[PDB]
Design a protein around this ligand. Structure first.
Ligand SMILES: C[S@@+](CC[C@H](N)C(=O)[O-])C[C@H]1O[C@@H](n2cnc3c(N)ncnc32)[C@H](O)[C@@H]1O
Ligand SMILES: C[S@@+](CC[C@H](N)C(=O)[O-])C[C@H]1O[C@@H](n2cnc3c(N)ncnc32)[C@H](O)[C@@H]1O
Lengths: 336, 335
């Protein structure tokens, strides 16, 4: 589509108000209160401890987005709410949305006006490093990121095979959602994770909980300045490229190729747009979101990625969907 | 319609990114640069001082929203962008979105999680009054609001008749973006804008810079504390109820009755939702925005309104649109 109407501009301009309506409602557990059938405003005010008038304002907003129904002054969850926003639901990501997206991503995006001009102010967050140097920000971010990545990680295990005596290197593997999931799926797999000190310290705990402390080690520090383990059987880079400066992209590929045994696989998972630069929409929006605290980010597109991987010397290069409408999986092999 | 799937919820959850893509682009004159025809990423960088890789990211975001087209490594304005987001377009409104909605409203909506639980930090902006203690602040708000209320003000200069010997009382008046457009349409018209000292002073510049400095007055104070000029022919209230605590509503209804000449009309312009609580969307969202810095605000519906009016004494009250899909106009007449 190509917009023609002022209304269509308005819808875009005012989307942030929609997001915050959804987000506020999650913070006060609105959808969970409705899980047992429709409630009135005052029935809602009671269950949530909100004032009847604020709840009315919030629910009216939600209804006008179709997030809930409003029938005879009674509110009820939409099918989407039932599945995605109720604590416990099959596809729940309410906590992901209100913790990381709302409390962190929303505010940070107030920086893009300066970030896209490569003119951040001194007091702004200018990188993951700077950002995660606050241990409360590292946690707020990582807890939701970990829960959110389990699904995709389980999706990933189904695609690739890492059985046998194999070593995995996860550059920027956060708190181990991928490495842990992979290690639970493949018996003889040993993993190494590289990340920032505050992220690694939380990671250690997830790895203990899972009883994998004997199979998953952390190598702490900035991945660009720290040494990686050599002769790995596979290397994973999930949401790394998006949060790193454009000038670093080739060297990461070259380093990766070099730390891989012959026959080894490079796996890159990230927000990637199609080369026609038309979408997917969420990949592009997330790319812009990372630019806000990564002002030297370059947009990844699928054919650049394929090309650079071949330029780097990899083979059997493929790029395709991972999370539908949002991320792609690129896959490459060091010759054997 | 009700949402069912992930895409539809994501669309809501990530709408803020969409909004910011549009805003960033405006601050940097993207669409204005594209007005002379499609441009490569490189050519775009030349015209804006922005770095190529970053224009590419901004432009890709926008193309995926349909705001620009993307063809052969070139970007061009969508017809909507060409019409409404280019500097000097008959219907340009890019600066309003850029300055008020982005620079101010977006930041203020971060207070919403605490505001709907009536629990703002002392740090937070907790009312129009508190907000406008800062002259720097009162200026940037009205700057883009006053110039944005001209439209609605014109559409109301086409509607009612303020002809003859007529006095006006614009309670909660702002920098008089209404009072000004009214008289200027109606040769013989008075004026009496009540408001806040920090904003008054700005509008005095707006009236002086229009030539009306002797018809329009100002009655400094907190409309709820300060007394207004009695016996008027018309008492406007635009966006007032929206940013005032909901317990001042009924009493604002009685008060406004007094200061009119029996036979004089009252006008309420504001965000009002249909009684069934389903929209319009922009009206519902704006009430939520205003609740961010008005934690005591009440949601205005069309029925409650028409209802309480009549209940206060007014007659032949008429509640109807006004800026479709966003605001309504009430209209009553004093016995
Ligand atoms: C978006 S997150 C998600 C982590 C994980 N790979 C996943 O898929 O859930 C990116 C992670 O990479 C880390 N990271 C970013 N840049 C890094 C760098 N230069 N060196 C090491 N770690 C980095 C961040 O700390 C963050 O935890
Ligand atoms: C959303 S604005 C719009 C101004 C103008 N009436 C218009 O139609 O564009 C609300 C105005 O009313 C003022 N205001 C809000 N509450 C007020 C109060 N309790 N007393 C006096 N002025 C108030 C604000 O200063 C602001 O200028």
């Amino acid at each position: 589509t190509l917009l023609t109407n002022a209304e269509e501009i308005s819808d875009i301009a005012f989307g942030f108000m929609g997001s915050k309506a959804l987000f506020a409602a999650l913070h006060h557990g609105v959808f969970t209160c409705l899980a047992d059938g429709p409630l009135s405003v005052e029935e809602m005010a009671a269950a949530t401890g909100l004032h009847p008038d604020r709840v009315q304002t919030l629910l009216t907003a939600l209804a006008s987005l179709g997030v809930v129904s409003a029938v005879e002054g009674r509110f009820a969850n939409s099918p989407a709410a039932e599945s995605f926003l109720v604590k416990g639901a099959k596809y729940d990501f309410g906590d992901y949305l209100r913790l990381q997206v709302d409390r962190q991503m929303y505010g940070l995006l107030d920086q893009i006006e300066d970030a896209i001009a490569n003119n951040l102010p001194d007091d702004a967050t200018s990188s993951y490093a700077d950002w995660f140097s606050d241990p409360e920000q590292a946690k707020l971010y990582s807890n939701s990121q970990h829960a959110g990545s389990l699904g995709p990680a389980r999706g990933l295990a189904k695609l690739i095979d890492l059985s046998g005596g194999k070593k995995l290197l996860d550059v920027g593997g956060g708190t181990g959602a991928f490495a842990i999931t992979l290690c639970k799926a493949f018996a003889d797999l040993a993993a190494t994770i590289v990340d920032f000190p505050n992220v690694a310290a939380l990671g250690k705990g997830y790895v203990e909980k899972a009883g994998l402390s004997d199979r998953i080690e952390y190598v702490i520090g900035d991945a660009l300045r720290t040494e990686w383990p050599r002769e790995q059987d596979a290397i994973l880079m999930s949401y790394l490229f998006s949060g790193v400066a454009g000038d670093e992209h080739d060297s990461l590929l070259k380093r990766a190729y070099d730390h891989l045994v012959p026959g080894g696989r490079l796996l890159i998972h990230d927000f990637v747009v199609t080369a026609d630069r038309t979408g997917p929409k969420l990949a592009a929006l997330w790319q812009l979101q990372h630019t806000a605290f990564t002002p030297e980010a370059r947009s990844l597109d699928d054919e650049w990625l394929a090309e650079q991987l071949k330029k780097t010397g990899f083979t059997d290069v493929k790029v395709g969907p991972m999370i539908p409408g949002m991320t792609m999986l690129a896959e490459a092999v060091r010759p054997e």
